[PDB]
Amino acid sequence: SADKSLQESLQKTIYKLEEQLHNEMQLKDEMEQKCRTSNIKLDKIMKELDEEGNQRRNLESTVSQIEKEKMLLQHRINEYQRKAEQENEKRRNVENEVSTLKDQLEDLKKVSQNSQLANEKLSQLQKQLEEA
Amino acid sequence: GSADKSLQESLQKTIYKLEEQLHNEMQLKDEMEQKCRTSNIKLDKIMKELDEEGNQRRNLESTVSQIEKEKMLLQHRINEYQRKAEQENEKRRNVENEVSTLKDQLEDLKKVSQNSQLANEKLSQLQKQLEEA
Numbered sequence: 001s002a003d004k005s006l007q008e009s010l011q012k013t014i015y016k017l018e019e020q021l022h023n024e025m026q027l028k029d030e031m032e033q034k035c036r037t038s039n040i041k042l043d044k045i046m047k048e049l050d051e052e053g054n055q056r057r058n059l060e061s062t063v064s065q066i067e068k069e070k071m072l073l074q075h076r077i078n079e080y081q082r083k084a085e086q087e088n089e090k091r092r093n094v095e096n097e098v099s100t101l102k103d104q105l106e107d108l109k110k111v112s113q114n115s116q117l118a119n120e121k122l123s124q125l126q127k128q129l130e131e132a
Numbered sequence: 133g134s135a136d137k138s139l140q141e142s143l144q145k146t147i148y149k150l151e152e153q154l155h156n157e158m159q160l161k162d163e164m165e166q167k168c169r170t171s172n173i174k175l176d177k178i179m180k181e182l183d184e185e186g187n188q189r190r191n192l193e194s195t196v197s198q199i200e201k202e203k204m205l206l207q208h209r210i211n212e213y214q215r216k217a218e219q220e221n222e223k224r225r226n227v228e229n230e231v232s233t234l235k236d237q238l239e240d241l242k243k244v245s246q247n248s249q250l251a252n253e254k255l256s257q258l259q260k261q262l263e264e265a
Contacts, residue, residue: 003133003136006136006140007136007139007140007143010140010143010144010147011143013147014143014146014147014150017147017150017151017154018150020154021150021153021154021157024154024157024158024161025157027161028157028160028161028164031161031164031165031168032164034168035164035167035168035171038168038171038172038175039171041175042171042174042175042178045175045178045179045182046178048182048186049178049181049182049185052182052185052186052189053185055189056185056188056189056192059189059192059193059195059196060192062192062196063192063195063196063199066196066199066200066203067199069203070199070202070203070206073203073206073207073210074206076210077206077209077210077213080210080213080214080217081213083213083217084213084214084216084217084220087216087217087220087221087224088216088220090220090224091220091221091223091224091227094224094227094228094231095227097227097231098227098230098231098234101231101234101235101238102234104238105234105237105238105241108238108241108242108245109241111245112241112244112245112248115245115248115249116248119248119249119252122256123252123255123256123259126256126259126260127259130259130263131263
């Protein structure tokens with residue numbers, strides 16, 4: 001019966017070993033499944049990382065080239081704004097020139113009517129000084 | 133008895149078979165744990181690199197849309213100033229024709245007045261020749 005003790009402690013050791021191997025097999029498969037999933041993903045993530053980087057660096061060139069074009073339009077704004085202000089001032093001045101000249105034409109017509117009046121009085125004066 | 137010692141021998145046999153198979157399994161587990169830890173280290177380094185690269189790419193995409201639209205409005209403002217300088221120039225060219233016509237009238241008026249003086253002085257001299265004849 002110390003006999004049976006021995007065979008029973010042996011057989012219980014075997015059950016614990018079978019339980020241990022089965023548990024370790026469950027752990028083995030669970031890790032395998034996760035590891036596999038993660039390496040699928042790793043490979044996907046790497047291709048996509050290379051694609052994002054290339055496209056990011058490409059858009060950097062695009063940004064810089066269109067910022068340049070934007071700048072060059074901002075300067076033609078400045079140029080065309082000054083041109084328009086200046087056509088406006090040259091127009092405004094030619095209009096005042098027109099105004100001046102109309103006023104100079106009126107004053108002058110007045111002076112020359114005064115001079116015909118003047119000359120009419122001298123003509124009359126000359127007539128009254130004549131020696132019959 | 134020898135029956136009991138043979139049962140025990142067969143049990144020990146199984147214990148060894150299973151323990152050895154256990155050790156074989158642990159070696160495979162340690163190897164795969166190492167591969168797995170390494171793959172998970174790389175994955176997390178690449179995922180955040182992916183995160184910042186894609187954020188910057190998306191950000192630059194918005195910048196592109198914004199700037200393309202801004203360049204159309206800049207061009208619009210160039211069109212507003214072109215129009216204004218064309219309309220101010222045609223206004224000016226019409227006024228410059230009035231300036232030119234008026235300057236001729238003023239010249240002509242200075243001449244009318246100057247010849248009036250002359251005609252009056254000649255006429256005064258003829259009235260004098262009449263008086264004296």
